[PDB]
Design a protein around this ligand. Sequence first.
Ligand SMILES: Nc1ccn([C@@H]2O[C@H](COP(=O)(O)O)[C@@H](O)[C@H]2O)c(=O)n1
Ligand code: NA
Ligand SMILES: [Zn+2]
Ligand SMILES: [Zn+2]
Ligand SMILES: [Zn+2]
Length: 248
Amino acid sequence: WGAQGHRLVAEVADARLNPTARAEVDRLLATEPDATLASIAPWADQLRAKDPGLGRRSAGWHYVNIAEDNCHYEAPKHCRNGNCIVEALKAQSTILGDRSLTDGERLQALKFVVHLVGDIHQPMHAGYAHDKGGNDFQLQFGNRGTNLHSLWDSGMLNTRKLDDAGYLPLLQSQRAPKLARQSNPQRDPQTWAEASCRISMQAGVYPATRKIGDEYTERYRPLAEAQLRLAGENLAQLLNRVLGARLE
Ligand SMILES: Nc1ccn([C@@H]2O[C@H](COP(=O)(O)O)[C@@H](O)[C@H]2O)c(=O)n1
Ligand code: NA
Ligand SMILES: [Zn+2]
Ligand SMILES: [Zn+2]
Ligand SMILES: [Zn+2]
């Protein structure tokens, strides 16, 4: 997602946190003055842009290209050295839940988790290696060029012309998505990447024309918005499991 998609996923999640998870998130955020779950949500993309070390090393953590294998993820094939969103979200979830670590180390893991639960719900972040998740699939949207990746990250969301205050209650107004009964931090990332990949491969998502506009938006913007709500709900479920109560 673009910055607004990331923040919306965090805003949807923030409202669903159980009291134990809410208190812990607020403790980790407090280590960084003025940080909120929304404000950190785009941080991992800024790190990629600005940091020629960890930013360059983390770039592959934002996606996993499995559509050529019909959305059947295999870690040794698609995620050599753990450099993809499935393995990165798993490890950062483990790190976030490690209470022996400093609040500073856990806040950094929270920044990655908030971001990656967002990206792993953007269909094009689980799409084709051939066109780099749509980045190399150029098209005309209205009268100006974009690419199919950008169109799903932000192009269609931008057509609402809402700030977060306007967009958040629209996502909350949607029918409740189907979640797993329970969070499994080690297994859900693959399940989510595969589900996102299956949307990238749905009839029409790749259009049969170079030029698209309001017809594409009216059919697919609802699916992009369903994925934001689903990401936000999945992110709260994950935070509630990893940062929730530890009795016994
Ligand atoms: N041409 C581009 C494409 C993306 N980007 C950045 O990448 C972000 C999206 O990264 P993800 O694909 O990881 O969602 C955008 O919010 C923007 O900051 C950019 O700065 N220039
Ligand atoms: Na609601
Ligand atoms: Zn994103
Ligand atoms: Zn993207
Ligand atoms: Zn990203």
